[PDB]
Q: What sequence folds into this?
């Protein structure tokens, strides 16, 4: 049997915790129950053998960078998380969530994920961002940042609709496989 | 199934009716000898079927018949040594709990039995509901479902172009007899958390109250989807219908 | 005799009365544990006493108590393997028949119990 520790790192302004618990909920779209707990963990196979999968919820708060550098050591993988239609999430990740995680452990498989891909092409939210002079992070932007850091895989899935979410986590589990 | 056949037989000393005198082999074949053959094979199955509870539960009266009629003392002893093996397997070996799904094939397009009825499915030990619905798409044409996870699809109650709906339902607990008072070790429970299961349910989070941001709790209601399966899980068939479905409600206090 | 003592005991879960709490060894000594000790020794006797009928006749409810209370599944299994051994001994091994004698000690010279009464004697196998 195997147990994987994964410190999920990303801003709380995007509320990736909803996505994480929804997957732990394995819910029907929009029918999950968010909770009061942190660091939601579970046990699901992808192939051959199920894994004690541990998704450490380090919220977007930067202050917790006092004991998140304890979470970084001895952690099997890491989930670095941003939103494709929240440009502030993009730059915050590349400035705090990408570098702090990268440098606390420059030797660990790292997976950049673009949240709100459903809204990356959302005409209303995109026209708001343009009115808010915010650039909708397209696939090439994340592709370039990934090849910049060489993340073991860069992804973009859905939270409210769970799309690619299961696949994203499947490659997350097979990452150590 | 083999038991069900043996269930017909009696430990009688004689070859009684040639109807049960099978066609694979044929000679005198006294009834107790046939039950003996059958019980050998059944226990072999259960051993390779990991269901040593059943193995022992039969091996008991097997040795009983041995001594009581035949004095198969060699068979007595070896049978009991196998019973010991089973008990050791029980305490030692651990078993996984299959995910459970009450499955609604909706669509007049399904056959008469396959339409509009919630079939509770005993999947594999660690099934993902998505891959389950995937093989349903392998199972049937018209690979499309209801997002109506909780309510039925009335249109596709009588519509063609079969739809579907599924989710991982709750394996309702088994009832370990005379163990509730008893500080039994875990092995019984682990063996009982997903087997011998006929009642089932799936979660229905609901928002009945004031949906303020911080509190999800004065609104949170679970319309538990109670199920009854016509037959034991595990049983003669992996899946089964729901014998009776029941919705529920859960108050903000509850 | 050891049985006769165990015959007093009950398979109860507790150390009940210190009267039966023997003086050879002494700690908590719950009743079922004591019957367990006693039945172990009794079965050992019968095995070396060749009386495997008794051995099995007790070992049955011994394993019964095992499962029904303690789940001594290791003890279940080994006990039953011994039961198998006993059955094999029964079918295989043969036993001789002691000559029997109803014995009249006559004489007021004998003690009160030893006088003028026919004592049936279980001799040796071939007396």
A:
């Amino acid at each position: 049997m195997q147990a994987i520790k994964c410190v999920v790192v990303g801003d709380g302004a995007v509320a990736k915790t909803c996505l994480l618990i929804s997957y732990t909920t394995n819910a029907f779209p929009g029918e999950y129950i968010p909770t009061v707990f942190d660091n939601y963990s579970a046990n699901v196979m992808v192939d051959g053998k199920p894994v004690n999968l541990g998704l450490w919820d380090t919220a977007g708060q930067e202050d917790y960078d006092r004991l998140r550098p304890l979470s970084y050591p001895q952690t099997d993988v890491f989930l670095i998380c941003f939103s494709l239609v929240s440009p502030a999430s993009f730059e915050n990740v590349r400035a705090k969530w990408y570098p702090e995680v990268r440098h606390h452990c420059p030797n660990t498989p790292i997976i950049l994920v673009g949240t709100k891909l459903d809204l990356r092409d959302d005409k209303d939210t995109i026209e708001k961002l343009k009115e808010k002079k915010l650039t909708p992070i397209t696939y090439p932007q994340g592709l370039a940042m990934a090849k910049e850091i060489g993340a073991v895989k860069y992804l973009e899935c859905s939270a409210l609709t769970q799309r690619g979410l299961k696949t994203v986590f499947d490659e997350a589990i097979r990452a150590v496989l | 199934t083999l038991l069900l056949h043996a269930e017909l037989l009696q430990w009688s000393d004689k070859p009684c009716v040639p109807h049960l005198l099978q066609r694979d082999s044929y000679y005198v074949y006294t009834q107790q000898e046939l039950k003996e053959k059958l019980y050998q094979e059944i226990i072999s199955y259960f051993d390779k079927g990991k269901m040593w509870e059943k193995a022992i539960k039969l091996s008991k009266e097997l040795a009983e018949t041995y001594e009581s009629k035949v004095f198969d003392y060699e068979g007595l002893g070896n049978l009991l040594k196998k019973r010991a093996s089973f008990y050791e397997n029980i305490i030692k070996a651990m078993r996984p709990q299959p995910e459970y799904f009450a499955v609604g094939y909706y669509g007049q397009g399904f056959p008469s039995f396959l339409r509009n009825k919630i079939f509770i499915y005993r999947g594999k030990e660690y099934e993902r509901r998505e891959d389950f619905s995937l093989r349903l798409l392998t199972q049937f044409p018209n690979a499309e479902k209801m997002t109506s996870t909780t309510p039925p699809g009335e249109d596709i109650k009588s519509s063609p172009k079969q739809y579907m709906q599924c989710f991982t339902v709750k394996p309702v607990m088994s009832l370990p007899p005379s163990y509730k008072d008893k500080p039994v070790p875990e092995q019984i429970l682990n063996y009982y958390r997903a087997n011998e299961v006929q009642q089932f349910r799936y979660s229905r989070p609901f928002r009945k109250g004031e949906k303020d941001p911080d509190n999800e709790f004065a609104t949170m209601w679970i319309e538990r989807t109670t199920y009854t399966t016509a037959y034991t899980f595990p049983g003669i068939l992996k899946w089964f219908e729901v014998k009776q479905i029941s919705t529920e409600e859960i108050s903000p206090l509850e």
